[model samples]
Target: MIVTSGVLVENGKVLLVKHKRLGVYIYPGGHVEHNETPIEAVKREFEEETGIVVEPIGFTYGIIDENAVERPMPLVILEEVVKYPEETHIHFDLIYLVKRVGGDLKNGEWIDVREIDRIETFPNVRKVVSLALSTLYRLGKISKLAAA
Candidate 1:
């Protein structure tokens, strides 16, 4: 199954949530639920984690498929290791760049793309941050964040 996630940004800062299991900072997202697109799943999971309603970018670049017409265009697709399984639990993760539309910052979080390198996070999280920060800047959501 494909899991979905987003690097949510606002006012030159990117949002990182405290994932319960990992107990480290990571993007706010979760598993892809039935009857929901990756974008929809990410949006729901992000809000559930961060309490922020995000306005995802409507268009996406790179590869396009027939199914893309009905689903959200992911900003990036990444393959991640779930565990060191004898059979390999590799998974494809859909990624998105989101701007906060509304909602409270009720959850514990992290911002500042500059501190990204020093912060403790999953290896794949750092990679997602790299891609998301650049795209957010181009989209005019960031002003002072360093380029990835």
Candidate 2:
């Protein structure tokens, strides 16, 4: 399984990568390295892609077998069948809420931050942002921290 990490910034923006093959904007993350832990991978990948130093907030979700498959099977089979053998089957995405600590923003082939309201991003991306904000509000982050 390939693990990925992404940051939700303070300005209602999220860092995403424009994938060459997928030809769509997705979160800034990639496959986990052999020697690195998942947390280490998040820090390393984020910096490598965005050129920004970020402290991972921690793991928020474990996404397994995210493939779109027709179901009516056992959970174990679903897990095994959904995974691509050659390709990474599972995604242990560590969702980190990061603040820009330091480093210059890199404009390169991959990484970039997109403001939610400023540009026309993918519909799913837009929905994710909205849902995250709603979750944060429900958790009382917005109320206690004050809006930015």
Candidate 3:
């Protein structure tokens, strides 16, 4: 299965939502639908879950292949095992570092980077959050932090 997620951090905090079934906080994301690209899916899912619009951060490099356009680059691609009560599947997750564009905040919380360790979430979430924070700092989206 293919999935896409967006990581949004601002003011030293990262946006996250709680999964009712999984009972853990996770980045806003979901399966990539039939007609949308991974980047588009992530953006859509993020807004749907958090009610906050976001834009992916990437460099086009000013190059392209014939008949192809530049797609936003993801921060990382992860292979994960998703376990449910009656089934299990492998998910190819594309993770994007994003910036807040517009919309009202809803359905999610901004957790301070320093308090990340206190939250209950998937193991990979911490790593992804750290990467997102550093990338944002490098991109000047947010100021440097002590824990991110």
Best by lDDT: 3
lDDT of each: 0.73, 0.51, 0.84
TM-score of each: 0.76, 0.57, 0.87
Query: After superposition, which runs of candidate 1 have C-alpha atoms over 4 Å from their true positions?
Result: 58-72, 84-88, 141-148
- After superposition, candidate 3 runs with Cα above 4 Å error: 64-66, 141-148
In model 2, the Cα lDDT at residue 4 comes to 51
Q: lDDT-based ranking, best first?
A: 3, 1, 2
Error of 1 at 112 (Å): 1.4
Instruction: Report the alpha-carbon TM-score of model 2 versus the true structure.
Output: 0.57
TM-score-best of 1 and 2? 1
Model 1 / residue 18 / CA error / Å: 1.9
Instruction: Give candidate 1's error at residue 140 in angstroms.
Output: 4.0
Highest TM-score model number: 3
Model 3 has an lDDT value of 0.84
Where does the lowest 10-residue lDDT sum fall in candidate 1?
A: 139-148
How do the residues 36-101 of candidate 3 rate in per-residue lDDT, one tens digit apiece?
988889889998999999988854455677887777678888998878968987889998898888
